[PDB]
Design a protein around this nucleic acid. Structure first.
Ligand SMILES: COc1cc([C@@H]2c3cc4c(cc3[C@@H](O[C@@H]3O[C@@H]5CO[C@@H](C)O[C@H]5[C@H](O)[C@H]3O)[C@H]3COC(=O)[C@H]23)OCO4)cc(OC)c1O
Ligand SMILES: COc1cc([C@@H]2c3cc4c(cc3[C@@H](O[C@@H]3O[C@@H]5CO[C@@H](C)O[C@H]5[C@H](O)[C@H]3O)[C@H]3COC(=O)[C@H]23)OCO4)cc(OC)c1O
Ligand SMILES: [Mg+2]
Ligand SMILES: [Mg+2]
Ligand SMILES: [Mg+2]
Ligand SMILES: [Mg+2]
Ligand SMILES: [Mg+2]
Ligand SMILES: [Mg+2]
Lengths: 671, 671
DNA sequence: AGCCGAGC
DNA sequence: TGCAGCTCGGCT
DNA sequence: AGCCGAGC
DNA sequence: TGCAGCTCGGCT
């Protein structure tokens, strides 16, 4: 037997023949990895090794529908290449004779997503052919072009065999991959996170499936949560946060191509994944159509998608541009950068563990994510209402309950009960024969509504006679015709009901990482707001301590510079033709201070560079007066700050933000 | 019907067919601007279909290429055209689903080329359709605005006589190459003159001679290299951008490309740029004798002639250390940098120290002409340049490829035999250790050894076996044959039989000279001499620039030293003097306005900042002494430069280049 | 017939 | 240049 | 039966 | 992420 219709397969010369069972099918993570293996095998490896590339994550066939399984081209390819048959039991040494290959060797990246793929392959064989695992059907090739040929020459040092030991192997695989084991996964990961936390307060040719799952795959599952579930503090996940950290660093005064920014992010922040995911993240951060961001931190310069297709109509990231919103640094003040804990990736300082915005951004743009064991979903809330709640809390008052609010949505959102809402579009009777639809419930896209609601009403029993569209890019308007009879009935029943203009929004999975990096479930947004509030208030306290110290050091620095300049122009000191050593010694003796700002930073020989690096211009009339004013202004600045409370600082930030939010949003409505 | 990318006009195929217009767009994106421009009402009388760029030139293409052309067939099916059918009368026009084709392309030169190719397609198969006025064009949210003003954007092509036939024919027939040379020669000549002086319906004749010809000429300007630096403009923009960036570590190719686009105003798809970057860095046998960019990653190999290069998003590059040795930074001061919309971009040409056009085999295809030069040896060219500097005639040069192990022998003027290497080991064995330049290993294996081993339907087998022992950069086949077959092959000529000899003919050495005029060179000696005269004269300009600049730097340091000496002696004070008083005083003591700034201004109030910006450290002992040394050294440097001739400067550059070339190449042999 | 490479 | 598979959980 | 989005 | 059509001239 040969394999005819699979272009990407390199079949082993002896596959399907008499030495079938001695043949190994290598499944690789992607086409590039195939090339490395095909090269490392050389001509001599072509005899007993086949190579076939997987395109990333494999269908989880456990509990997948029959249709999705039968139609899955990748699984069907593997089945064809190996000679497998659904429902066949491979116990006999004779039942094996119908196979073209005797084993599959999995070859992925030695990273967490690689482990996920190994597990999905294991899951696939385990679900359909458990018997196969008893014969040691599965193996893996671990790594850290010339290096390729080397790895393969030493293949038996890179080759690990999966081993089925008992029913605990079955339980582990099922735990990882069964849709019925979600709760077990929550417990599984809770134990893992707790145990690792404890370890931090202090300090085989063969591998069972139980150990692979519990010691290797679990690392992917945990990383999946870390990358997919947002922080309560800034509302970001790590990829989004790396994007903002990079934009803040670059400080672009003009638009940058999305693909170019993504390349720049990967470099500046040690992002370790495919840049195409990064580009999608960037697009998602810039979107501003109804039902996306309430405050987009990046500007969508170009086609970033519309409500017609829910953003699926975004242009390629090579053709669109972005830059920071003017609101971004008002929300994430640069001064607070000094208070953050910046992370390190291999000696390089990259993004902070979290930013600390002036309002809970996790509520503003609708934190959303799917991990393992847990997922997160929050709706959007109104920025002004949140600012008003923070002010109330600053004044010792109680915050008003908040309803979800989406920018530019003309519809209605009603609270049914805790974390349960009815979201309604807008429909109104014009005359008999005519209704008009001018808003769709949030996250209902215009093209989808037309196709799934209006078309079926018009065609396959038909309820309406006709409809017409008068949409713009940002608005919806359908005019629908029907007989009085039908309209009267439609109207008898609820119009919003018949035209499917009501959806429910339920939020019982507000799961976020707290400020300590612990995953937590929040019951109400008021709980989220309060936890954010206490942390942010504490950080305005830190900001004030930081500023008083730094501005104090700056004041001392200017006092010393000014003293030196006044003494120079009066003849009280001279430096002309003095040696460096003597000038230092002299300055010390006369009580000048080693760089005060440098000393302060370090505290978080003497250095008189800050004095002697001043230009000769400094000795002239206008510059002397200027220096005296700067020195007195700095003194007043520190004094003014000492008098203020952290609450006052927060209130200043909120006022500046609202002012610009007003300008920006008015301007958007003109445009 | 059954054609995915087509948005058929509702009335297409009905009784209103001839009143329908099919809009053919330049790519899928353009199709969308059109679809949203027609609004709802437009869908009735307008279809939209996207072209994937350049259309097949059908005028003399083979029947197979035409029959198998997917996009041509789709257009034919959509419009309802039929080969060979005449459309003279009114009855014939009745089988058409559309009455008009409206072409909508970019308003640029490549857009004109596509209009031209579409016109060519219809004119060739159905010239009867053109005398009716079948073809028209649409010239260019904002989309809806163009389509409501449809008539101001709609231009109709007009067939007006045999001169329309000749023009279409001139442009697109394989038989009219010579006419195109003359056609463009006249255009270049005429445009050249106005350069000294100054500054609805459309016939096919006016379209071809007024619009298409601008593409034909632009095609030459981007495809045919300059004699001076061996670059086309895209390549030149790339190097200009690398020089400006001065990267000290590797940069992703995709990212470099994005950086070139913005820094140099490259107005084409970045994917083209990424391929240019890859081609500039390649260093396998038969590519570049000197790669100006380093290939960090998989940039392709001789196995597949570079077709095996990985994606530009996964590979990195940076300047070769040879780059600024060949294109010295000092010479940038002599170039003519171009402007694109107020941004200064790359120069008309760089002026390297040897004729790079000969080193890397400048090569391209335009309209009317094409260019092909083979590679020449860098050291041999350096030697020839040194001979010319001594007033001697350069020796003739044969093409020479780095790391090529075979032979290249002249057969006639501009004609060479290039031979690989094959030798008889024993009476059953031959060994092939080199393939002729540009014969790739995998292609040789598939097209020569495989057929020799297996025979074909049309040829017998010659060999009994072969084995491969290649490395990434070398070739080694060991071939088995019967004694009888080998004797036969020897008698016929082993190199001939084994396809290890090819011809290299160079009768199309067409380049732009230093004035930007297209020229045909008969010998490389003529290229070398023209280059030499220009480069020598630019060494003269460089000396004149260096004497002026160093002179100014000397004057600057003289004034700084003087002021510092007069200060530390009490001869002058600035302490507490106003700006005006101090400037007036410096004038009256005869201090010079910034001499370097004054000199740079001359190359196209009093400024004493270069003095008064000096730090206070300047007045101290060790800095006084250091300044006096700098001053005296600058003076020595001016006179050192003044006793060097242009020829001396050139020889210094040549020596520095050869030293690094030896180092670089011997390091390459190690690795 | 199809390569070469800067473009669509 | 544009096109397409999948995972994971909550929700519908 | 499928969205949401950071990933392969 | 990887895959594929075409132009244009000189030559194999
Ligand atoms: C073909 O060769 C390989 C493909 C892959 C997958 C993949 C697999 C697909 C498939 C598409 C994709 C594709 O994802 C699409 O990318 C798009 C990128 O731009 C944005 C705008 O939109 C994204 C799509 O949302 C995503 O669906 C790949 C990008 O990065 C990957 O890892 C993806 O449709 C068919 O099956 C992995 C490999 O080895 C690891 C391969 O060798
Ligand atoms: C599908 O949508 C459109 C496609 C196009 C063509 C195109 C057309 C093709 C085809 C491929 C291509 C492709 O060229 C390939 O690109 C590759 C890009 O990376 C490098 C490494 O290697 C390049 C290939 O050498 C080139 O062959 C396009 C890239 O830029 C273009 O203009 C190309 O195979 C089938 O037909 C134009 C449009 O509107 C103007 C479209 O809407
Ligand atoms: Mg990986
Ligand atoms: Mg969102
Ligand atoms: Mg264009
Ligand atoms: Mg070349
Ligand atoms: Mg699911
Ligand atoms: Mg041709």
């Amino acid at each position: 037997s040969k394999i005819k219709g699979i272009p990407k397969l390199d079949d082993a010369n002896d596959a399907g023949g008499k030495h079938s069972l001695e043949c190994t099918l290598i499944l690789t993570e992607g086409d590039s990895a195939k090339s490395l293996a095909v090269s490392g095998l050389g001509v001599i490896g072509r005899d007993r090794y086949g190579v076939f590339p997987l395109r990333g994550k494999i269908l989880n066939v456990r509990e997948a529908s029959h249709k999705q399984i039968m139609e899955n081209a990748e699984i069907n390819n593997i089945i064809k290449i190996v000679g497998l048959q659904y429902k066949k039991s491979y116990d006999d040494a004779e039942s094996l004779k119908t196979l073209r290959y005797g084993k599959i060797m999995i070859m992925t990246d030695q990273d967490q997503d690689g482990s996920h793929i190994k597990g999905l392959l294991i899951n696939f064989i385990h679900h359909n052919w458990p018997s196969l695992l008893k014969h040691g059907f599965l193996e893996e090739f671990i790594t850290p072009a010339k290096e390729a040929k080397e790895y393969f020459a030493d293949m038996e040092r890179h080759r690990i065999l999966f081993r089925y030991a008992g029913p605990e192997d079955d339980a582990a695989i099922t735990l990882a991959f069964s849709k019925k084991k979600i709760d077990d996964r929550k417990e599984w990961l809770t134990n893992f996170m707790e145990d690792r936390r404890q370890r931090r307060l202090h300090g085989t040719k063969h591998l069972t499936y139980n150990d692979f799952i519990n010691k290797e795959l679990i690392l992917f599952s945990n990383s999946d949560n870390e990358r997919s579930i947002p922080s309560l503090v800034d509302g970001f996940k790590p990829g989004q946060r790396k994007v903002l950290f990079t934009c803040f660093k670059r400080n672009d005064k003009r638009e940058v191509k999305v693909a170019q920014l993504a390349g720049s992010v990967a470099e500046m922040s040690a992002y370790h994944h495919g840049e195409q995911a990064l580009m999608m993240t960037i697009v998602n951060l810039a979107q501003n159509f109804v039902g996306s961001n309430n405050i987009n931190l990046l500007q969508p310069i170009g086609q970033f998608g519309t409500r017609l297709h829910g953003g699926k109509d975004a242009a390629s990231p090579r053709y669109i541009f972005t830059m920071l919103s003017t609101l971004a640094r008002l929300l994430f003040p640069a001064v607070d950068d000094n208070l953050l804990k910046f992370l390190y990736d291999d000696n390089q300082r990259v993004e902070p563990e979290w930013y600390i915005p002036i309002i809970p951004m996790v509520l503003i743009n609708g934190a959303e994510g799917i991990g393992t064991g847990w997922a997160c979903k929050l709706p959007n809330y109104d920025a002004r209402e949140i600012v008003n709640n923070v002010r109330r809390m600053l004044d010792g008052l109680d915050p008003h309950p908040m309803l979800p609010n989406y920018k530019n949505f003309k519809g209605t959102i009603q609270e049914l009960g805790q974390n349960q809402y009815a979201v309604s579009g807008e429909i109104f009777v014009v005359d008999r024969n005519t209704v008009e639809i001018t808003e769709l419930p949030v996250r209902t896209w215009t093209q989808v509504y037309k196709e799934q609601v209006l078309e079926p009403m018009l065609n396959g029993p038909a309820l309406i006679s006709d409809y017409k569209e008068y949409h713009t890019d940002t608005t919806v308007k359908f005019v629908v015709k029907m007989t009085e009879e039908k309209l009267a009935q439609a109207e008898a029943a609820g119009l919003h009901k018949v035209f499917k203009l009501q959806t429910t929004l339920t939020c019982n999975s507000m799961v976020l990482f707290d400020h300590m990096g612990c995953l937590k479930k929040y019951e109400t947004v008021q709980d989220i707001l309060k936890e954010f509030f206490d942390l942010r208030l504490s950080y305005y306290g830190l900001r004030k301590e930081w500023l008083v110290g730094m501005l104090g050091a700056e004041s001392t620095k200017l006092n010393n510079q000014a003293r030196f300049i006044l003494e120079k122009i009066q003849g009280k000191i001279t430096i002309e033709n003095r040696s460096k050593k003597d000038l230092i010694q002299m300055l010390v003796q006369r009580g000048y201070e080693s760089d005060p700002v440098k000393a302060w930073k370090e505290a978080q020989g003497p250095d008189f560079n800050y004095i002697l690096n001043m230009s000769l211009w400094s000795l002239t009339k206008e510059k002397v007066e200027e220096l005296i004013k700067q020195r007195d202004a700095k003194g007043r600045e520190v004094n003014d700050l000492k008098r203020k409370s952290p609450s006052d600082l927060w209130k200043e930030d909120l006022a500046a933000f609202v002012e610009e939010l007003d300008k920006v949003e008015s301007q958007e409505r003109e445009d």
